[PDB]
Amino acid sequence: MKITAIHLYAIRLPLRNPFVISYGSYSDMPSIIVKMETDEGIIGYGEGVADDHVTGESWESTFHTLKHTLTPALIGQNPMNIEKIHDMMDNTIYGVPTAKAAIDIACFDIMGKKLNQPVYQLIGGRYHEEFPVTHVLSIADPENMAEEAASMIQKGYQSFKMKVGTNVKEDVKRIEAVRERVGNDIAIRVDVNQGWKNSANTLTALRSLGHLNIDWIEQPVIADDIDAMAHIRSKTDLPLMIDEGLKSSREMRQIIKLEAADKVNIKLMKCGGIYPAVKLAHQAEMAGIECQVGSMVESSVASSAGFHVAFSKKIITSVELTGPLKFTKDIGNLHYDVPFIRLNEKPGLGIEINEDTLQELTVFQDIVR
Amino acid sequence: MKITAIHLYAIRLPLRNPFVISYGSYSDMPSIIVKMETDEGIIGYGEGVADDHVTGESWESTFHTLKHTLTPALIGQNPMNIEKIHDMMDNTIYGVPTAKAAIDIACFDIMGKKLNQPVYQLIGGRYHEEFPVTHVLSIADPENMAEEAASMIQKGYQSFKMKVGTNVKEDVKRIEAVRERVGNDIAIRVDVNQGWKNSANTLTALRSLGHLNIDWIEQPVIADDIDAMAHIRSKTDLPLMIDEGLKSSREMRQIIKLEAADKVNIKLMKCGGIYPAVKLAHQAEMAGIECQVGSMVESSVASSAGFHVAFSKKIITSVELTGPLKFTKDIGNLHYDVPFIRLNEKPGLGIEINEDTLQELTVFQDIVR
């Protein structure tokens, strides 16, 4: 099998409501779509949703990295040899996990369609039957966050992820409000997106959250400070998750060496795709670190890819890919059974791409041969 | 797909010459063969070559562990869901990597035959085109070891693994003899199989091997002493490999934490098969530890499985599976191109099993339904 052409689509996914977190507000979600063609007629779809604040990659930079740097060398290569494909991309350019992920996902889609098997059957098989879906609440005034939670509870949601990180006192008030409104039978996890910056602010914040039954605190400090995460962990009994601070095996090695976390948020966009994500899961398993497969808020394409990894591993105990539930328009048709997510048994990513929607959301594109 | 039956064959592979190492001498190699049948008619072959001195598993103990403990629960399960199969086996019984490997290998053979792809294409794809083959020299008097090396050099061999470990002074004489006979353009690695026992004896031995150009020293101390390996590594510049001291991710975690090795000998019989072997490779990669896929001296079945793992990973830089070259009779037909090993592109393990040879070597058997 040989790659004959790679279509690149710079699209923008419309959000029902702006997604607001500690480091930024998103009115919509720019994404790069990959359509990989082969000499055998088998097509594969990939996606790269870049988050400037996490990996230093942007919508436009990713489009061009793919067009001028990554894809040229890929023409003629076999999508089935994923280890080789990744070695070639890594030898060509360091980092750029989001760009590499777009390629990796398309290769797996092709592999599954070629072998007529779901992607999860190719990376360990099916392990999970379903996962609960967690609703992510954007930053807002305490009462506003509490009201949205109540509203989503009527929709069937039983697990929430609270976005905080602007001011410790205010963040504590936000969390108290939500917990008070939903009761103690609703799951709540808190994501600071680096907002508390250091261990002192974090430990002070944690002093007021012990009685609120928080499942875990995610990335309270600046990404680069793994040392601070380990220090906080030595002084609190609340589970800690690292997100922005974990991208590749480089950071996983440090997290393990320093005992810096109880959980890690593995994301295809941070490590380079399905293949690197599986390696990270295997590394975390060695150290008994629980894993979650999150996302940058992606379309059905990358979201499906993430689930295929999650459903194939026992060490992955939670998932956070809800882009399709946030967008008013999607190029794929990944189906959710809120409050649960299950995967069908169709080939590859197991979804269908609406060509009309794809072109409708495309701002600019190119084809590399 | 469902497993309908599992045939267990207790066989004995005949050796041209006894294989002699530090901890024992083998006149032949007892092995357990697995023939897995499915409701779809697809058959898979697995193999478990137990080494009592390494994993505490024996020929007979493995046969019975498979018959009474592992296989019963496997009937009805899907061989394609390898993560699930391993979780079930692990939940049933701790350890017994050789017994689990026999099952794991058969599952992959079935997966490849079902998808009409070589096993390596299912665990990362093809990365390597070939590997040099290293001839293992059994322990013997210095001149006798040097003569066999000269003899094998005429056969095309250009890489040798010297078995030593009975007495430091004598082991040094053995190594000096071989190097002196073959010249400095021949690769030589030394395997002590725990023979020097501790760091003091090892460091004393290493003082006399600096000018002999040894590629690496393998397992100089007792298996359980990872601390000693790290101590030796802090005081020598000769590459160190751990074998018996590494079985599962439990020891890999320690090796990484303590910086105890430059290389590790990963073996399907020590970790439970292809799936666990891949996880170990991923873990080693994180820490920059070079990997080799060795063996316990196995038939074409397990030897092929080992190569499928090796050929799919960049981190695996050497291989040591030469059972087929040591036996006067083999149940499989794995082909070697001494001094090289290449893999064909046939489905599954890519080999053919000679039913007549299998029954000829069988001492006792059973079928579990």
Next chain:
Amino acid sequence: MKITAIHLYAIRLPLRNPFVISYGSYSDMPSIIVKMETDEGIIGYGEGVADDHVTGESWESTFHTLKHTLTPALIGQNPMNIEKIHDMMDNTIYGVPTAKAAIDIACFDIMGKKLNQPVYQLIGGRYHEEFPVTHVLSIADPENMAEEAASMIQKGYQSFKMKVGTNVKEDVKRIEAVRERVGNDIAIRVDVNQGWKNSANTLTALRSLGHLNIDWIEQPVIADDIDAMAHIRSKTDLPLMIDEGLKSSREMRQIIKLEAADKVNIKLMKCGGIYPAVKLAHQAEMAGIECQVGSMVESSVASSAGFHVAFSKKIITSVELTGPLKFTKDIGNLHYDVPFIRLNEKPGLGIEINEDTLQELTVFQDIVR
């Protein structure tokens, strides 16, 4: 003062001869030039030479990161407030040091021209009067490297940097050849550009270089492995320098914590410009780590900026910016007095930009207002 417009020029600097190192060969050097205009008429020039293999930034990706992400927010900002400018860029996007450097350099050029002072007078003043210039020898056969060295010695060079990293045995032969040809009164430093990959290969290589009087060994292992650098340092007495393994203060923190290096190669393209480079120098000084200001092979623009940092700090004891000596065409006119480099006392970067040459080398451009 306010930034009114930023011109972006995607150019390609022609090389007299291809520059060849362990990870790649360069026929020419693609660069992004920044021309910053202000409401006061003061113009500033910046430059971003991206090295895909070091920071995950490319020629095209950098052009677009600047055009769509970094520059828009900069319009209206005061170039004089460098701390603020960097905070804004960092809040906008993580990483992308090369893109940020192009902006930072232009700001300093404007600051110096506005205050009518050389850049070095604005970041500590002049400390050094001159620095010796080291000729970088691209990878080639031992005799070919030795001959080029002899040739450059006639040109006045008395210090050489040998590029190696393809094979330990061959690299040792290259180094032996050069030292043997130039004698022992010529300075030689060796740069492996990650070629030896790990500590085992590195320590083996170092065993044969003790009698060759090598000033220091630069980046022998893969960039991400700071642990390996510390391990090598614990077992050798040859000075060690980290290059690709050091980009931002994140890695400097690890290098200091782990005692991983004797020297570090600080580069504007790896940390984001003059301002971040000064911070890194201050951090290294605290731990007694010697610093060198290297480069990615840049035009007079970025090369001058690098020297301005070097000449202002006692902790910076060597420099490696020779792009202007390697290109057959340059947009700036930085003057070298081989075997020495001195800086004039003109405002800003102290050089003149040839508009005709700039346009001649431009492949594509844009202006952001």
Next chain:
Amino acid sequence: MKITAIHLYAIRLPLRNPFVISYGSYSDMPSIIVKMETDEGIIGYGEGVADDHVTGESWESTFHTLKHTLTPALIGQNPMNIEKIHDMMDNTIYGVPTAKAAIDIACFDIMGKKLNQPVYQLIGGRYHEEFPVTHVLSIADPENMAEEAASMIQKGYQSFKMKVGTNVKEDVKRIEAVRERVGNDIAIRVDVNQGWKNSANTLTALRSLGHLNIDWIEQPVIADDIDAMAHIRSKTDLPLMIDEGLKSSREMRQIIKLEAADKVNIKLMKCGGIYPAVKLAHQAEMAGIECQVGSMVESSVASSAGFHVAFSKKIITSVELTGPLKFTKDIGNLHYDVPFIRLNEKPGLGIEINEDTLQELTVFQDIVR
């Protein structure tokens, strides 16, 4: 530019009320003023307020160190080359940060006046717009401290620094009294000035301060014991600041290595001036340690210099320079907008020196040419 003469003035700044802390009581504040003249007519003012208990420098010792040791070598040197000036002073004499600071500040005043820019524009530019001003309460009976706080609250103060450190039980009573009187919307930080001496006394004290909402505890133990600070930090969740224990980069290195503090009080008088202070800020930033620029209670001269550093760095989040608010007479005219401090945009330190006041407060003086 060349230094032509340096005037040294030994003055005494009158205090409205005696300043009382754990290690001493001050009826007034002896200070050394520096008036630096240049061949260009540009004059610069510097100041050295020695605290015998912190750096081992005294009013008289500093006057003489400047007159006989530091200034002679400075005559003829260029004030613009600060890195060089500091290297010369350091090569001449180790330590004496207060004496060196007096020189460093005058050089920066000249640099800013020469380039017609505020000092902050020369060391990173303006980052902050304003800082809240914290009123320092001298040690006194609990009720007396509580009353002064109430009184200053009417003056507009909303942040207080409580001086304690004579007896744990009594110090706790002092803190309880003040918090009870001002309510919970007033910021309070506690400075023990080494009064609790060790970790046992400190941890016992902290047991009773958890419910009083203290922003941070400053220097509870003896200066030289960084180990004790790290031990306390491992057993408390109250933010810890080091003051007397931090002088030069020597102690910063230890603080970072041992994770001994959440915050550090950087002072020009402890490190040698503006230039060394900036280096310390850069070092702290690497480790995520928050910085504050404090003072020894200085005139507008040194106080202004301190603010210029603070206003130029994001890592500096608080300031403590209130000498001008404590003295009944000042030689400079630094303006405060209680409860805030803002900096004008005038050249150099941006203040005016009253020659009449200077001579009025001078006890003895000299001129070095």
